Symmetry: D2
């Protein structure tokens, strides 16, 4: 379903913007399920709290590109909505080689995002399809931003900034290889979660709505943050590596 | 209890590592006794606080940590009795194929391991605690295809399509090798390895316990036939195994 | 003059690194002047002048080069470049571009196949471009590159050839094709795995630069080769799909 | 003589491949005869003999070599070998062995650093060993190697040297050191990234073989180099830790 050129772009940049996937007849229907669920927040577990979103998660407009970059037996790992309002922000997280202190060691791989390629197919264990439900067209409007090539980085970036005592986020201060991505309502942004990315500080009025769905292999557990391994090793979850929220 | 440099070299290069004399005679007999109190024995730590302790013993955890290097989760833990004429055909292999029903894939992300800055990173490893000696092929020895854990080419798909009826475990292969162990030994295994067991011909019974470990985001081990209609089905879809055509 | 953590991170992630103001304008003019002793390409500079022979070994070039090759070093080429109005350099390089070896197609060029191991980059072929004049807009013929093409797993150019395209992306534009602006006396350290080229220079004037390629000691000095010789004795570099093949 | 699927699997997984019965016993006899006319190592056999020059280009060597290099090909090496009683070759090679460059330590040797891509192996330096006599026991001076050492991520030999070891693994043994047994007329196809050597020959009577080394057209012909030279002009191969450094 993805062209050769699309695949080349997702592989080299770590994400792909697919224009105009949903006509604003469906977009409105999606926002209405979001207004309706209000009875600057995050709308958790959408597929369980709405039949309209349970259907979206399984939509071939989402599954088809996802299969093309995961190429494993698939499992829906998460689905949530987002309302980004004025002054909201999201610092950088992700990145292929960020460090994590375990008890005895430091590790530089996060296998939940560690991706490869073999015989014409990408194999990314964790990707996210962001369905945009309103336009985002400048940095100050709170645009998706990313560190170029960070999904294939061999070096850690953030640990050094922490021991230097840096206290500002790169999405504020800027970085030579930090880049923004502008989208339209109804666009899909297919994302390799190994990419180090975040969101500019929204300075403009008027809310910003998006839904996101996370897919991975059938042997991955549904997304749940975990702070460390459990005392008896029975517990499931995702332990993150160095993120800017740790020190900014 | 932590692996030496030479031990790590051997695990990386061959896909496994036999660790001698981990558990004493008394401990083995304790494990034997407990196993008898309860042919596969699924979910050991559940039904035996003796085996629950075993699963978290540092003599297993410290070497496992050195080849996984992630926050750990216990994925499976089972006991095993092998009788005469029992055989496990070949399964695993880094590049075996799998048809997804609209494409053909050559990686299994549940065993796809890597290496980075001085540390191995294997997402699925298994610790075999042997409770009896296995010292010859006819004893039903552990066997494996050399370097099969970092193979780039599939091996079994072609043999299915060429119509082979028999297992390499029986017929042999130029790189098929056996492993011999004593009671008390641990066999630390990368599940990317293509392995199985020799058909046991001798009498008596072989006993062992096995503990599978992976990162905390791996689901506990269970067979899945395929991905499900609602993308909610969880578990492990295997790739081409000899059971599929032998 | 080794590379910071950050510079290493940028080179590895983008396939190149601009190192601002390495040589003062006194040294630039001395480089400028020497090149006028002779559009145009001026090959084997280290031979033709003691100034460039000295530049090829300047620790300000060798120190960053060593950090990205991390092998016993050999100087493989050194050349000058005078770029005039309407000169253009179509895209070449790229990690997974195809090559017909006759009986088969191959997708790795082992002369630019790079890796990473225990905290070090191992890039077998890197260039250091020393700029002798400003390039601050695309119309001035700026260096341009396809983002992340130094680690691409698919070919970009073969499908474009087979589909009939007759235009360079350098002129066409392409979504992930971007420009690099430099200042006189800046160095651009380049992983030759990057698919790169230059914008067509539309402005009057001459931009001058010199370029030095480095690799391991078992690499032969750069020399173009069309194919393997019949007696397997011919040495040199066979390229894969480049845009000059069909534009 | 195209390598089958299983042969490629075996070569990829073990770093070598024995191809049985490539040359007839008369061809073998011709080669043996040609080696004694040239009367230990026999350097540059192709320059010495149009018989070995033709062997080097023989398709029964080039076809399997192309299947594991998959680059524009160059003949880098061609020598004869006379193995006598008490001769031994200590371990050399290995994918991750250390080398000290003078201001740093490195763990990749790009001359043997191999990869795989879209159904093809890409080994930059492979050897085809043509045996002119049977070697059927370790005491006969058999080829031996460390298992999976062509894809090793850790160094083996540094720790051994630093710990003050005196003996080579080809003598003392090692848990994963294995032997290869061959018939005259067999070819051994070898990824030079494999850590290998030969057992100490205890049996009587010379054994003979010829070896040809192949790599891409930009590799320089084989020659040892002790280090990178001050003027960056030195060409050849600097080895990493080998057992003859401390044994």
């Amino acid at each position: 379903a993805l062209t050769r050129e699309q695949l080349y772009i997702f592989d080299t940049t770590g994400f792909l913007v697919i224009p105009g996937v949903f006509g604003s007849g469906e977009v409105e229907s999606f926002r209405s399920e979001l207004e309706r669920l209000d009875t600057t927040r995050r709308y958790p577990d959408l597929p369980a709290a709405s039949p309209v979103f349970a259907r979206l998660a399984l939509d071939d407009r989402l599954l088809a590109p996802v299969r093309d970059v995961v190429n494993q037996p698939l499992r829906l790992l998460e689905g949530y909505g987002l309302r980004r309002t004025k002054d909201s922000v999201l610092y950088l997280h992700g990145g292929n080689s960020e460090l994590l202190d375990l008890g005895d060691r430091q590790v530089g791989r996060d296998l939940s995002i560690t991706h490869t390629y073999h015989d014409g197919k990408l194999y990314c264990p964790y990707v996210k399809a962001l369905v945009y439900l309103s336009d985002i067209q400048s940095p100050e409007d709170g645009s998706f931003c990313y560190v170029q090539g960070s999904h294939k980085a061999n070096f850690p970036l953030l640990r050094e900034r922490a021991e230097r005592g840096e206290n500002t986020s790169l999405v504020d201060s800027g970085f030579p290889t930090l880049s923004d991505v502008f989208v339209r309502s109804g666009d899909v942004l297919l994302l390799n979660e190994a990419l180090m990315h975040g969101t500019r500080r929204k300075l403009t009025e008027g809310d910003r709505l998006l839904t996101a769905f996370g897919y991975g292999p059938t042997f991955f557990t549904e997304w749940r943050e975990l702070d460390a391994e459990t005392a008896d090793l029975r517990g499931a979850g995702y332990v993150d590596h160095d993120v800017e929220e740790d020190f900014v």
